[PDB]
Amino acid sequence: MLEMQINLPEVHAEVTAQFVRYEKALTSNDTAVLNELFWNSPQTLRYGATENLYGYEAIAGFRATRLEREIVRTVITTYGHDFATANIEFRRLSHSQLTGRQSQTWMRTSQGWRVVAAHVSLIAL
Amino acid sequence: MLEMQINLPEVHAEVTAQFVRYEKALTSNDTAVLNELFWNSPQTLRYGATENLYGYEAIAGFRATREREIVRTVITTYGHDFATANIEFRRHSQLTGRQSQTWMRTSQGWRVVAAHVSLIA
């Protein structure tokens, strides 16, 4: 019945708050929170702007070696109690001619909401 | 517990079959199937290699105006009703493509609720 439980209000606001935590950690390079919010599994993956990383271990390892931006559109959708997508467009003044996209899928784990897969890319429109 | 229901094999096989359908439709430009497999909702979105499309209507409208080798595939299912599918692909020898999808079990079957495609060096 997931399609008749879209954007439930407690669920939608919870995922929103975690997304905001993620975005603030990204712009301050708070790697501990960036890692905290990724699902600790070998299945977790991140297709980043410059590389592809498979598994939590690879992602967390990358974060240790790797900033401000404006979000211009956001769609956060929740499906039932335990799953969600968060999609944003963004821009940086450093690269005026490009538009960034970031997609995340989130799952309610027994330690909270975590990102299970993410993809980031910048394109010219 | 959802964490203890990763890649259940019945569920994983369902999602995999639809993903295969999607890939064959993409390579034959079978737009009917490509649209059939996207969630028919205004929330559905596709960040494509060259444009951003919001809502099923925009996506299906784009498909009406529009070969590759898959090099790595990860399909993961969570419980009975949700899944992700991620692939790397190549066609342009200097670039590697990524395609990410999230799938949900709807009352008409498994559908893609969001997707992102991009190519990098």
Residue numbers in the entry:
A (entry chain A): 1 to 66, 71 to 129
B (entry chain B): 1 to 66, 72 to 96, 99 to 128
Quote the study on this structure.
Differential Scanning Fluorimetry (DSF) was used to estimate the stability of the protein and showed that the native protein had a Tm of 57.2°C. Well diffracting crystals of AtzH grew readily, and two different space groups were observed: P1 and C2221. X-ray diffraction data were collected for both. The AtzH active site was sought by examining the X-ray structure. The arginine residues form an extensive hydrogen bonding network with the carbonyl oxygens of 1,3-dicarboxyurea. Tyr22 and Arg46 are therefore well positioned to form a catalytic dyad, albeit one of atypical composition.
The data presented here imply that AtzH is a decarboxylating, 1,3-dicarboxyurea amidohydrolase. AtzH belongs to NTF2-fold superfamily, which contains 38 protein families, including the AtzH family: DUF3225 (DUF: domain of unknown function). Size exclusion chromatography performed on AtzH after removal of the his-tag, suggested that the native protein had a molecular mass of ~ 29 kDa, consistent with a dimer (2 x 14,655 kDa).
